[PDB]
């Protein structure tokens, strides 16, 4: 509910309302950028330098078996000893879906151990982003295949974080084996050998056809369904089968 009241009190000022009413969503990115180490090794010497959420109190004890404090009360302040304690003895989840999107790293390791070096001489995007959107963001697809089914099947209900999985999938879907090890094979005066080994839109939002609906409308409701829906992330349009 904080969302709507922040909307309400954000538009109270005329200056912050003219901006929100005049510019369109096409100009989102151009206005986001108008924002204005001994520092690290100075707050690590003081207690409680890390920020955590309130639920850490229920799971992590205040003091350890020696007597050292782990957190303090006034999003609370915690110490790295809490992180080390969590790594020592905490809840364990043995899910297999953690490397579900990390293989693009793993073959690298698989391409490193299973190789022989030999002697040394001293001689002198859109077509991917569209499927990424329909795989990770079903509720924010645009007005637009076996890979899509496979991805939805293998990682349906075991998500970790949309941003990380989106980045990993973009990196994976979008010779390179020789290029990736250029720092080891080639030198300034030496060379080292190495072997790797759909619906249609009739018009704008219509208030007579009830309230709008979400994208997940596989139930066609007698195949007529002249229904208002939010396409993409913009306006509302009418839909016919």
């Amino acid at each position: 509910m904080e969302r709507i009241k922040e909307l309400r009190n954000l538009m109270s000022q005329s200056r912050t309302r003219e901006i929100l009413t005049k510019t369109t969503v096409d100009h989102m990115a151009i206005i986001k950028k108008y924002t204005s180490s001994l520092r690290m090794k100075w707050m690590m010497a003081m207690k409680y330098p890390i920020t955590a959420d309130k639920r850490i109190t229920e799971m992590v004890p205040e003091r350890n078996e020696q007597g050292q404090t782990l957190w303090s009360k006034m999003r609370v302040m915690v110490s790295p000893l809490a992180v080390t304690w969590w790594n020592r003895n905490g809840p364990m989840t043995s899910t297999v879906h953690y490397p579900k999107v990390y293989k693009t790293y793993f073959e690298k390791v698989e391409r490193l151990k299973h190789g022989t070096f030999g002697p040394v001489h001293f001689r002198n995007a859109k077509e991917a982003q569209d499927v990424i959107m329909e795989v990770v963001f079903p509720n924010e697809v645009g007005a637009r295949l076996t890979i899509t089914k496979e991805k939805k099947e293998e990682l349906q209900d075991c998500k970790i974080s949309p941003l990380m999985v989106a980045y990993m999938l973009e990196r994976e879907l979008v010779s390179s084996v020789y290029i990736e090890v250029l720092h080891l094979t080639q030198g300034t005066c030496w060379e080292q050998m190495y072997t790797p080994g759909g619906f249609l839109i009739l018009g704008k939002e219509d208030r007579r056809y009830g309230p709008a609906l979400s994208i997940n409308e596989l139930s066609n409701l007698a195949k007529g369904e002249k229904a208002n829906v939010l396409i993409g992330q913009g306006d509302v349009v009418l839909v016919m089968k």
Binding site: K41, Q66, P80, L81, T84, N87, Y105, K108, L112, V181
Partner: protein, 50 residues
């Protein structure tokens, strides 16, 4: 030095020493521990891209 993360089998006394010692004594395969918590360093020229 900056993250107060020394090896488990060291005599350096910091505020994180007790937890690192307990974790070091608890584990069996000590080569799989991260450098952030009492782990050995396995980086070399060939491992710079992993």
């Amino acid at each position: 030095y900056t993250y107060r993360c020394h090896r488990g089998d060291t005599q350096i006394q910091t505020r994180r020493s007790f937890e690192l010692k307990k974790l070091w004594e608890q584990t069996r395969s000590k080569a799989g521990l991260l450098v952030s918590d009492g782990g050995p360093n396995l980086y070399n020229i060939r491992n710079l891209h992993i």
